[model samples]
Target: SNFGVDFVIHYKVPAAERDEAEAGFVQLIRALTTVGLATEVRHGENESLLVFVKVSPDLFAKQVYRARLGDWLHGVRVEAERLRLIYLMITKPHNEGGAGVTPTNAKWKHVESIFPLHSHSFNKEWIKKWSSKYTLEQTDIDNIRDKFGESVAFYFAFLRSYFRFLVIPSAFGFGAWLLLGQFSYLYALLCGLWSVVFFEYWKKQEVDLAVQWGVRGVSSIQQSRPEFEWEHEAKVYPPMKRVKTQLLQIPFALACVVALGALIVTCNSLEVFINEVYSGPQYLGFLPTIFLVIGTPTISGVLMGAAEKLNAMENYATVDAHDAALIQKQFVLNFMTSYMALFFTAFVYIPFGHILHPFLNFWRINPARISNQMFYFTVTPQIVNFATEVVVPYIKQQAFEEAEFLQRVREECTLEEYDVSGDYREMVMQFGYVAMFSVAWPLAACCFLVNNWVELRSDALKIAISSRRPIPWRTDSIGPWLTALSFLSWLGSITSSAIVYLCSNAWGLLLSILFAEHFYLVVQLAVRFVLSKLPGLQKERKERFQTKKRTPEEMFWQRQRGMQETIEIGRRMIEQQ
Candidate 1:
């Protein structure tokens, strides 16, 4: 099989303006040829043009070497030259050595889409090869980086690492279930501590992966956002300015906090009123569920829009900084919105249900029953989520593409764009489940483990087939999502403690709250100490030590010295002659 790198450049034009479009297309073709890419143009439907781009193996290899050198100079390790060559630089704008074709940019007015070529054959081979393996080796992550780029690889790395770390807790959870039972104080304490440990471990893991992948602090070099507009530059240190600017947003942040809190309370109140206070049919129980189904997204959308506007108003200097701020705000809202109901159900309604039930003229709410039902509710929705997120999308995308293919054959047209935000959101939701509510169900980790095994492959398939190729972006970590995960773990600790207290009679609710708070603090400190002193290795330390021993500058000079010595030898041979 050929292992060549290629991409597509799609140009669209109206039938009425065919001449202008054809002229622009010819210019683009001339520009591509100047960059050494061989291109072939085919007529697309509605007077569009499909340009297939290919580079010679020698040129592709050299570009890969240059990219590796660039990464090395920026302190990233180059894994393999062959793997690096797999990713074509065609998506980058012309100024950045690409074809500079984009839909939004007017310079490429006639150009509609610039997408990397998808390889079903390659992806299928990769998935088949990796799936049969017991563990995802560093080479596996490297292979993903090779094919998709760092951003996508980072997620797969995170999932693989997370899945491996989960084994310890999953075993403990099983033991707790068999011996101590659900909601046992011993089990809750263990799970809470495990959450803290896993989080801390993963932090170290992220750093190691970043270094290994040569993407540590990669965001610093990222290009400014196309939408970013800035005023006169300030001379202050960026960090100090960032801190000051972030502080300036405090009032808005606090306001958001209050708004989110108020929303949560209102939703919970409606739930309580509908389920308990209102005298209605049993079917009315579904009313609270229905309300949330409709209300949460509606409210969340408005808040997200407001938050985005606020971010834009802040006018961060870099796209990285802008994305960071937006994601931070999003995480805050998502945590509160996604987990607040579970929090209320576990802590407030169940523990003090007796008092609240009587006062509200409702039946006694059993903490045990709620806990039991939560397991089913949580697990069942996950299956549904996976089906809708993966199966449904895959089917719909396939159907859409098939129809497009037929249309292309009959009418000669091509679809221009694909949206992947939904794909990302699906992954985040799956992560939240494991991070936030795994303690509630002992088998949650195991179920998720199984799901992720499938999900990894499915998501890869989706990116390759269902969606447009994402522009390669560098990221050291998952950004605010890591913080979000950390937040969920912290909240999970408290949630678990509360459930334990409510479900069992070992300790009173007050005592449980006190112990839980203390336990959280103690575990946090201990985990920090443990991880700092003896963080687990993703790769052997010897490899890292060797890599670090030769700095980029030092290596560059060493190569220069070797070349000089060769030249001197050649001069001596001429003198001897």
Candidate 2:
């Protein structure tokens, strides 16, 4: 009655292939009377032992929500099941202490020792009754269904389309309106506020869904590598020494970060020196173009090589399943930061100054020539500046990257094995195209839209089949570099206002000041955005800060006496054992 379930050892494993190691465990399980470690055994035709650890109410409630996490990682698979533990902790609490569990006591090393799940300990009576069933010609279908039938299709479908096509066009259109017609400082402020709010809202939504499911804090339970080859094991009850495995990653992470930072800084500096300082003809734009083209690739190659070395050093048994997963996730953050920097500088700033302004000046296009009412209606030089710079190029680049990622995945998967469902919407479109093509010119729009629609669906399906890692949850701190670049670009443009105005003197200075003001507004907005993304810092429970809180007088003296007593106890235990 103490045990929730019987200790089952229903093995169909052939005598020749049976694991000698597990046989010893089975015998040990058969000798115990009380409930011990949780395990599942299912009979099968094949000679393989299928073991699953069942959850008890006590363990499930206490351990479900809290897990020690590293960096911004929010999800992990446990017990051959895919569940996001971080999400669970935020939305739902464990039965025992719920959200009251502190991160200090949530570490894998601490939990494992306190509540060990041993295979070699079980009830003998339960095992005897469990093994009495005869083998059948076919394996139990219900058992297989229970194991693999659970689907995450709804979640995947929702996320696959969420980040596509909307934000880019909206940002571009708003930028055009502000630059050309209104020239309102309020417009820039609104844009900055919108970006911050969107990012924060998306983060909260992720936490909400994570809690709705029961698998929060699952990442903390992943087993360390069996081949870790530790130098020593600790003698303490809840060993502090086990966390040293994590320290191995620190050196590798630091090296990669340094190399990445140096490459970006050097390239950016060289770019400035060659383009503006060197004093070349208009055709010299090719120089900066070549630098970006070559430098980005070279840096990417170096990063990939470093990633390979870190993987080898890890020497993990399940690299694809766990280790490479975390690395790939971190790489995605790096890529996002790099792209934002490239997009802001190349498309948002440089083209506005070098291309749009010069072309406008050649035509003697003056903003003062038009009346304020007509100026709002007319496409002023600033409007042309926003379109050529920030708007069109950002849209093209983002669309290209997304389409290319999906296209590559489609090319990699096996077409025959995947039961990818055809979109009914696409089927109807093809029918409409055939039926209406002969009737009207407006039908061409339908064809174009249909083709683009097909491409999106194909890309989504390809990603599902080819991608190994789950899509990472977004984090606020992923790209400090991009924010830094935005601020620097703002500073540089403000400092250049004097020179830009001297050339035209009146309207040029006006527009330059407008641009500088917009950027400064962006700087303030980005700072607030970054700070809001940081985890809640409120001190809710004072006792969580320490294992045990004591009077100020006892604190210093207790540490000194406790160390001596611990040493004495260790000496006695060693002598007795």
Candidate 3:
């Protein structure tokens, strides 16, 4: 075994089940033995036995390469083909030549978790090297490709590029705020063009990285989830019925407004009373948070459950499509729930502060209070995500883990799985602050650029040390996140423009709204047209690089507000002047 272990199976025993625990435990070992895996039983917590497993060197290395991912997007290799062989051997159904040593319901009740060990050696190096270096090179990324898998590699590399792309925003963000101030059009123009160009840039970046990692176009290859319900011959499941079932989401969207609405309204009412009528303790300001912390998620839980039951009924075949469908409802709920309060602050408080005082002579809440409230909204989530994502896990482990070799393995068995979804959501949500709401606080991108530098280290550390190694799932793209980003960016143009438009004069009000959105539409097309034309000399379009195809989707980004419409604005500008 070379004095090391490849993977660990958690063999747990119960106090009352002692009579059968040993017998069942023996059966667990016997199953693996049949599959040619060697196991060592080390003691863990008083009730558990740590099962360390190894495949012989010859078999293990081949399996390692087989699934390590083929670096040749152009071809495959038999030697590399066997990389995931050991895992395949263990988890493959017995009929398919595997021992069925899976954690499926009936596989073995005693196996609490099946996971691999951390390379503590590499963990130290990643922290040290990445921390010391100002930036990650292409070389730094490949080790992750070689060690972890393509998905994690994509996440790290993508974020690295995302941070670099932000330099324009964060730096210009500083300059725009310094010179022009918040309610500025030239600023929004940069952000709009920034949004258009980077995505078009990454639209190519995704292709480049996908081919570099050799996982290009591999999204088509993923298998269906275990419970996926698909019937090729028996089920037509016509498009008509599928669209009908989805009508539930529109109704569901209304429920979200009401549910999260009832919450904010309830909390804000007292917020009005406490801050205005009573003018009591400042700490009591968190009363609304206290209310939401306890109350909001329950409503969300109910809706979340409602969402799942609906998706189950809709029935999807692949994990990707199913997750895509589920996140759709959640994003809807989050949009209204999380961002609506900010809406009141921007539209309700900031714009009409001059008018609102006359209307509210009672329990007097004011505009500044709302501005202060949003400050926390923008900042605290980043602090907490960093804490909860990395430090909390570190704290929990440090509190319980001992120095013994066996004890170290025990903690890892019990450690959390790296949750990338929350990170992805946080990044997207922070983006919401920048794109839509960043005009309110111009430092939004600057703050984001700083946070991401640590977020990079924190997320990397969490995966390497704070949690179990992620399952190396490979995919060609960042999944629906790119869509979310584009939607947020598009939504940004609408919301940011409206916020700036309404707040400044803040409007005619329709003319102002129309002009800003018109300006946004025109800029988006010009940027799209320009970025595409710049990249034509790459080589063959499909031979390697082809961005022009995806740009067609960019076509429907908006219908034009013809140049003649702008002619009216010009004529009016002179008359008004």
Candidate 4:
């Protein structure tokens, strides 16, 4: 009650089940006490309990040092580490010094959810500061890291890095749109270069930021999933059986390409024919949109079902591994659905569109078709995306909760679950458009670049106001999305070169593309080599730590003095090489 609270644990019960509710409440309190969490309960509207969860500072400090000296996991400092420790202490198995209550399991079913209270005062001022400021500094992300955690702060960090990098392409985009026009080779070259540079640069940031936060490979430290089976229950199944199961993916692959491929191409065909070929009242144009509305989900549902079963069969030993596999399958679905249309327009329609003459009696050249589709890709979604991303979540949070912290706590159970992976999906998809499709519409980067300024604040505000405070989970990198980014950049290199070659009149398209592809490989190698030579955040952090050590550290270094002489000889031999 003094400062409100740092956390709320909603312990809901049936109003009629009063006999056991009190017993369970006592049990809950004891478990909380078992893990050193201080609890204070308040009456709920329907005989439920609203419990506050906090910890003794000294007890927490002791654990931080206790686990830290020997165990690298859970050893980091500051608010995230503190919150992460509390979360683990409450939920980890009893043998691991936790309360032994799993949040997602039956034992914790009465425990609705846990949320850290949002500091509305700081939340307001922070957004206001960002709203007014022209640029974000490192301090803003540091503050976010303090408030949320490294996992969340990494987003803001990447978001800002993306913002800064976009300015280069955005400026060039506007200039290209005005000066170079559609399918300009110069624009493609520069944007491709920018795409590669940004992805690699972001890769470095992932390495450095994790080092900065002292949370390298935090994934494995927390890898076990409660729901995981087979591996723990019995000996692992033979790979031959799993490989046999995966052989069914052939049909699913065909289903995606055949079903989705047919659907998108059909709709695009209708889109072209109704506008250019038919040339009547445009109300008929709704057929494509309506057709897509009907077609997408039917196929999506079945394929997703197939994908889900396939993923379950893969028998991943851990949650992250399972999710990573599922995400890859889902990416296949998303990749085809998201970019197949553009692939259709660029690869088929523009290059070989003369094939459309006999079938649809359409004109050969359709520069506008691809060009105009890129318009929909960039502008229309920007407006609607913010509405869903920031607005809906904000509205949903505010609708019942109204105002003030106490009421917010009462309604915390009703608000959204913050999933970082979902947002990364959207970000990657948006980048996909600019990376591959931007050759057709140069200003797409400029459009997205400015749109995200509002998007940045909105995302920050969303995390602060609308959604439940995420568990301060640790992640060293963006996880597999880095691979997605790399894949996208490669696609950008290939497609951008291909599109430019296709648009060129008499430059020998395949030869030009071949030349460009080899050049991309060469440039990427150079970039990779140069980037590898650069020092990450680790060396500096280690250096500073070395300098800051006490008297015992010098004595410890002297104890290892024999090894240093042997290591020095090896280093000298390597230097000679």
Candidate 5:
């Protein structure tokens, strides 16, 4: 015989029917072998037998042709054999691969439809037969090992990048401590500019990595899990219940907001009591601010935990949903704590402690004396603290979050899933929030620039490995208008700056930063609504749009031709070497 197959077959009969099924299966094999259809038989892995067949080349070709016909010849034979074994298992009630009893007529069809296949056995035979004429490479093992090692290296790189971010911020803090002093406008502006540049550059880096990984659009276009029950799987394909996890996102945000508001109010109230009401205590003045900052995240985290549990109740079926829920929970806690603490420390504490309090106490009677150093010490810290807390953290946190997102991708997925095209890069570049805020808090640019470097890198890695689609790393006028509004708030910071310069800290800098953040948020929301409803704004491009009408080979030729035309056009535009 010129052609032969080395195939394997195994069955996992339910415990009660194993004996009968085994006996019947052996008898069937003996019958086939006796008929000279099979040349040899042997045992196989996982309780199965191996069968070898020797046939003429003509018979092999005929079998292949028949299989391709899809007339159910192969399928029917397989189904019949399966049913026969199942019947034997039930009747004999003594085989490892079958059930002891058959179901009644009503349940038979369903049971038969769901009959489990021994896929391991099937695949072994399938691979051997298919690869007989082809060279099978062991190179995939090396590839898998290389991929795992790459994942490990990415984590170490992320840690190094994060440390780099901390270094710049620490340097700024140290410098402020030495030359410019806390609440220095120049220092703050420098930090903000750094922040803007970092964020912008990081966006590009993330796109580059995403392109390396082919999974850039993995998240955006993935179908819902098969287990996900749908209420109406139609135009909207509504799930069994509106994912309750989404509700948790709102509550998580609200909790962070409340925690921040509470911490600010408590700290300020204590400051008021110590400075004005508690005439007996000078040291106690600093105590309230210190404790409030420390307590903010602790309280917020406890609340966030509660919110997370509520989200878990929503019963998400996939890993993506689970991760999203966790992110929402963590963001709530971190945002609240960081926002409240920084706001009080930067805008309010420094200006008031150093400038406003002394001025207020010294010139109790003269209105012109409001500009004096005595009055400045009492209230200036209040304004500076608020501005720094409100504007700086908002920008920095967003940058950090974006960077962290990239790191997550590198950790989870490999490098073959990203889309690094010109369109993707353009989308990323178009999204800028740091620039808008630079108008008011000119320092806002510095802060974003510093953090954004790590963020962009991190997000790039994350999107490449994790995201289903290339999420254009850009913010537009429609998505979150608050970033632009943040710019206006920076103007408020300037107003506070002017107030400090003219009358000292009579009203407190804390008030200014808060007013700016709040006002910015409201305006941003209004802008978002307006933009969302506006006509003809592209949101996200669909994959179906990019899917070619041609086959893979045809598309390759089409692209080749297109590139040639592009090159010719370029040559006409400018002389090429």
Candidate 6:
């Protein structure tokens, strides 16, 4: 078969309904065969069944092309029709020219997971090949897509491009810290510029990659969430449909936000109270810090659960949208919780630490000393975060997988789902650390750049080898995280500027703060303007415009005609010679 083991669909049946289960399995097999898919059934753990599907190479290519075409037509009124057509082509009933294995249907209720097949050997070889190189190109990205899928490949493409781009700012950050000093205006300006530039550049890079992968606007075709419930759907416009939802989840959402905000405020206040009011033994001062270190995650995890509950209450139409909303809330809560103390120290505590020192009657606080302390705060947490987020998780996942494999060897165990969402979230948080506060400790960019290189490889290994193969989900962009990154960049400018002003004491307090504020707004606008005018950004827009009205057929013929014209010209030139 050309499809060469496309996917595995596992069906779990109750031990008491063996006859009914076998009958249904046989019917499903026949239905799939009728639709031109080759299927093999095997006994699964605990009275379950596994169906491995393959399609002819030609048919697989045709379906993929059709899927790509549907992706291209996304956002149009006909997108629904295109999507349904493709769905029928690949997974609908036999009468609908599909394999009769729709995930949303009750007929597939027994199916636990439907995932693409991946070759461990191929993944290992490719990871090794890519790791040996310092850079990645479009071909490498294409190879990744071929081996894994677009969703996984896009992340690697993003990291590869982002890492390479970091070289410019990394060099500047190191140079500024070593020579220009930490609080230099030039260093702050450069860091702010780099943040904005990186954000804007990545936006264009993301679109370019989406186009390259033929998955631009793929979100429009995403299936409705299984839990999505609508009161009514109306065609409000050609491209905009209005779905009235019966559930008003605003109160729940607001409640979650308020609760999270209260938690953040309480945490911040406790840290401040401990730092300023507690005049006990020096060792006691470390208690609140230790409490915060332990307590923050505990609280954050609870809030994350609240956010997820709120998301479920909201009942978004698509899984992507639901995940995006949840991630946004979580990002806000996590960001504030993780950085509020640092924010207070940089902006409030250090600048005003002396003012509060006499009240506490412990020791005098020096602004320079506080500034130097930021170095430890900046670098130490990052190393700890790296160890916790990447190293620990990798080790744990490997051990778990090994144990699961042993269990399967003894008594067959169902494969676990591969989830890359946690890894992606960690990467965004890591990026936020650098974007928001790298100006305070200029070496932050260098450290982050190095960490990302290691992170890229480790995460690839985790996804490709250590976990069960993931479903080949398509996403045009990194969803709501882009918004979070942009927000961080804007916040970074303000925070970095404030830190530089307070620490340097270069100008009158009010004047310096005012200058930094104005400078931030101006730099933000200037960065937006400059990035919009860049050739690469302009090229993406031009290509998108050119392809907007051009169909696949027309594009193919145009290329064919161009090739013929070139050939004719070459023949004429040969005759002339």
RMSD to truth, every model: 11.9, 22.0, 14.6, 9.1, 20.9, 11.6
Summarize candidate 1's per-residue lDDT along 1-577 as a digit string, tens digits.
Answer: 2224355666767777766776777777887776678776666666666776776668767787787787778765532333334333543556766555445434666775565555556767887877677777888788878767777787778777766776766787778667766767776677677778877877888888777766776765665554444444751234565577667567866776677655655655555666555688555654554446446665767877877777766656566778777877776666566566676667666656654444334322655554544564455555655665568766775686344533332221243233333334545665566555655677676777777777766666666545555655578777777776666667666667766666665347667768876887898999899777862254547767777997998886676466678799789899999
Q: Model 5, range 1-577, lDDT digits (tens) per residue?
A: 1122322222333446565766755664554443234445444333333333333445444544543343233221122222223223332222332233222221121121111112224334433443352321324212311322222222223223333443464466456555653334554344444444343333333333333332233344322232333344332434535554465567657756775665565555556546566666355645655555445444654765676676555555553565455544554344345334433443455445444445345434221221222222222332333344335444654564343432332222221233332112112221222222122222332343443443334333333222222212211111122233233235434443333333333454565445544554455455455444441112113333454432998886676456678788688778844
Could you tell me which 10 consecutive residues in candidate 3 have the lowest summed lDDT?
74-83
> What residue pairs are clashing in model 4?
none
Question: For model 3, how does the per-residue alpha-carbon lDDT over 441-494 read when each residue is reduced to its tens digit?
Answer: 666788788888988777887787777866556678887877888888887777
Ordering by lDDT: 4, 3, 6, 1, 5, 2
- lDDT of each prediction vs. the true structure? 0.64, 0.34, 0.68, 0.74, 0.38, 0.64
Write down the worst ten-residue block by lDDT for model 6.
235-244
- The runs of at least 3 residues in candidate 4 whose Cα sits more than 4 Å from the true structure, single-residue gaps closed, are 1-4, 14-26, 45-48, 70-77, 219-222, 231-254, 278-315, 354-364, 394-405, 535-577
Compose the digit string of candidate 4's lDDT tens values, residues 1-577. 2254656777778757668767777887897898787778775546467888888678888877765863544543366677777787777777667766665644566767777766667878898999999889888888888878877888888888888899988899899888877788888778778887888788887778877776776655546665444433353556676677677777878867887777676677667777776767554644564445445445655766778888876765566787787777776776776778778878898877766555455323756656767766567656656766777776765665323445656666566678676567667878888889898888888889888788788887777767778878767777777798878887887788788877655357777677766767777787778898884456767877987993898887675458777798789899999
Candidate 5 regions exceeding 4 Å error are 1-156, 165-173, 209-229, 232-260, 271-284, 293-298, 314-322, 341-577
Q: TM-score, each model?
A: 0.72, 0.33, 0.77, 0.82, 0.36, 0.73
Give residue 428's error in model 2 in angstroms.
35
Candidate 2, after superposition: displacement of residue 471 in Å? 13
TM-score (C-alpha, index-matched) for candidate 4: 0.82
Clashes of 4: 0
Q: Candidate 2: give the clashing pairs.
A: 85-216, 85-217, 85-218, 86-217, 87-210
| Worst 10 contiguous positions by lDDT, candidate 2 | 108-117
Query: In candidate 5, what residue range of length 10 has the lowest lDDT sum?
Result: 471-480
Number of the candidate with higher TM-score, 3 or 6: 3
